[PDB]
Design a protein around this nucleic acid. Structure first.
Lengths: 103, 117, 109, 54, 142
RNA sequence: GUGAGGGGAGUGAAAUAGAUCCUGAAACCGCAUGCAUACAAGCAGUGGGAGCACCUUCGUGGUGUGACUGCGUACCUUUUG
RNA sequence: GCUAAAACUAUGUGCCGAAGCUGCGGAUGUAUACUUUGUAUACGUGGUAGGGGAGCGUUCUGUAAGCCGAUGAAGGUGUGU
């Protein structure tokens, strides 16, 4: 079994027990998140592709925690024009652990 | 109040040289050359954070084209057929399935050509 | 456990002494002594002095056997230079550098 | 005529890559047992058995 | 890091044989270059060689249209002053059939070490026989 | 070589405080280990990325290196540029 | 490299294609309402010469006959954050 899910404006292909990082969510650590907008479920020969979505499919995951990625440096410089500026960045994320996939 | 510059100046130069680790020749030893090298690296990184998305989309499209032509369709016809069939799976997942699961991709192509018909 | 000898302030360029150093790096002490004894380089005399000093230290201070020793480590460093003046044509003067070097020899079994 | 750019340490060492020294031909003299330079009289005046100095 | 690149140790190269009798030069060359580069495989990776081996037989029976048999020119320069040498298609095909295919496919492959490695997988022969029976090539009709 | 210089012993809290001797940065020059490098053309990086070596909580981990590959003609000043 | 084109004329159906637009996450300027709020909504955030606003570090004076320090200050050299 593997499934296709939507989260954070992007799509993921997941299997049971996978740990993945998605865009920051408002759920608390230790909570359960349920996806009911599954796009595709595959079990060997059994294939289900949703027209927009698969009716009745579910993917359940647990929230592990939140964090920030590694720092990125932004540099801008216009040569011969006396211009230069800099800034740093660290993007937020949420970590999920897939606990159940049902078609 | 006379101020000496040594400690702060040494700290700034040492930070620049530390960021210049790994470059060839004077680019990792000499402060002037190293300082010019770090700024150019930053500019390149800024540009390539935009170029990366285009490069990966091109890779996905090529793999989807190969899978479609294995199943008897072209890339453009397969994309149009999926759009007509209302499937909204994106190219990244489509290319992953094309690489790692031939049967599922064959099912997707069957759906697309059935919608095209 | 290596035995060390140092020769500091030898009046020769380190670039010239290194040619002799890499000639004997890693060899048996008897073979190195033969090479130095029949070399015609000026640095051979200095390198031989350092090597015999190291062998004597190993034999006397540490009570080792000369038959098993080898040249395990050797390198040449730069020393303090002397500054001189050389007069050239038309009233111009140039600076002359007289270079020295330090020689380090380690022997071990 | 002079350089327009300073030469790097890598190219300097590449030029010097042909500067290594070479060992001489040494041989143990059978008559006296000492190591001597091949085809040369020993330091104490022996060559192929004959002696030069009384 | 969910999009994976092909691993060179896991790439399988297959052997195909193509007969050039009566085919158009460039329209055969494009397909040959595609299969040499590996564009027909779902594991295609730009920095990895994934293509196949292509043997070409009857290389002197390839064709060109129009008046290109007499009018198409091949140039080279020996780097001595005035050293430009010139030939045409109909003499070159009689003399060295393999160099025509070399030029045509080299112009369509990438210019670099990977391209040099890719072009090594094409074997061109004038007659109808090839010495690669041990590799058991499969007939490919392109 | 009754030289210079060093290795022991000894003094001292400390001798890599040993005489132009507190601390001992950078340019510059050596030795050692790991990886890469002798069919390939350019501001030397950047975004990808196989393999190898060591460490390891054995990992979707850490450190070093970087085959192959897309893009890419330094900085300052003065100028319509 | 291309000739019932991979050329030219006309028509049609798809697709590719930018830092443009949309999606998700984050920061900030101004204004309107919450009738303190730091909160929501709306519109903005390419920049030379210039104008305006807000800050980081360095040496010295008071606070300081205080607080830290041979169970190790300043300085030097790595690592993590």
């Amino acid at each position: 079994m593997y499934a296709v899910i939507q989260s954070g404006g992007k799509q993921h292909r997941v299997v049971e027990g996978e740990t993945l990082k998605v865009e920051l969510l408002k759920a608390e650590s230790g909570a359960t998140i349920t996806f009911d907008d599954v796009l595709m479920v595959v079990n060997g020969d059994n294939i289900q592709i949703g027209a927009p979505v698969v009716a009745g499919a579910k993917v359940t995951a647990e929230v592990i925690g939140h964090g920030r990625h590694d720092k990125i440096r932004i540099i801008k410089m216009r040569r011969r024009k006396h211009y230069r500026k800099q800034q740093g960045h660290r993007q937020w994320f949420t970590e999920l652990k897939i606990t159940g996939i049902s078609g | 109040a006379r101020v000496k510059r040594g400690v702060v100046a040494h700290r700034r130069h040492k930070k620049i040289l530390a960021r210049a680790k790994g470059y060839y020749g004077a680019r990792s030893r000499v402060y002037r050359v190293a300082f010019q090298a770090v700024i150019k690296a930053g500019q390149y990184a800024y540009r390539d954070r935009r170029q990366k998305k285009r490069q990966f989309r091109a890779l996905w499209i090529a793999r989807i084209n190969a899978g479609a032509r294995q199943n008897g369709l072209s890339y453009s016809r397969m994309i149009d057929g999926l759009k007509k069939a209302q499937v909204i799976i994106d190219r990244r997942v489509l290319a992953d399935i094309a690489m790692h699961d031939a049967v599922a991709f064959a099912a997707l192509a069957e759906k697309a050509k059935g919608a095209l018909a | 456990m290596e035995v060390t000898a140092k020769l500091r302030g030898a009046a020769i360029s380190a670039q010239k002494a290194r040619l002799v150093a890499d000639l004997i790096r890693g060899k048996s002490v008897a073979h190195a002594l033969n090479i130095l004894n029949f070399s015609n380089k000026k640095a051979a005399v200095l390198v031989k002095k350092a090597l015999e000093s190291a062998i004597a230290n190993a034999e006397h201070n540490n009570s080792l056997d000369v038959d098993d020793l080898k040249v395990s480590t050797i390198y040449v460093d730069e020393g303090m230079s002397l500054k001189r003046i050389m007069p050239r044509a038309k009233g111009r003067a140039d600076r002359i550098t007289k270079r020295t070097c330090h020689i380090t020899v380690k022997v071990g079994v | 005529a002079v350089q327009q750019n300073r030469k790097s340490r890598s190219r300097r060492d590449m030029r010097r890559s042909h500067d290594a020294l070479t060992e001489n031909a040494l041989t143990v003299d059978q008559a006296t047992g000492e190591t001597h330079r091949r085809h040369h009289v020993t330091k104490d005046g022996f060559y192929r058995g004959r002696q030069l100095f009384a | 890091m969910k999009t994976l690149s092909a691993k060179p140790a896991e790439v399988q190269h297959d052997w195909f044989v193509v007969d050039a009798t009566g085919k158009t030069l460039g329209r055969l060359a494009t397909e040959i270059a595609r299969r040499l580069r590996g564009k027909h495989k779902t594991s295609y990776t730009p920095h990895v060689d994934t293509g196949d081996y292509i043997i070409v037989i009857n290389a002197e029976q390839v064709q060109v249209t129009g008046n290109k048999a007499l009018d198409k020119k091949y140039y080279r320069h020996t780097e001595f002053p005035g050293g430009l040498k010139e030939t045409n298609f109909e003499k070159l095909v009689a003399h060295k059939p393999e160099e025509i295919f070399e030029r045509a496919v080299k112009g369509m492959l990438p210019k670099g070490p990977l391209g040099y490695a890719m072009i090594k997988k094409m074997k061109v022969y004038a007659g109808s026989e090839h010495p690669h029976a041990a590799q058991q090539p499969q007939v490919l009709d392109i």
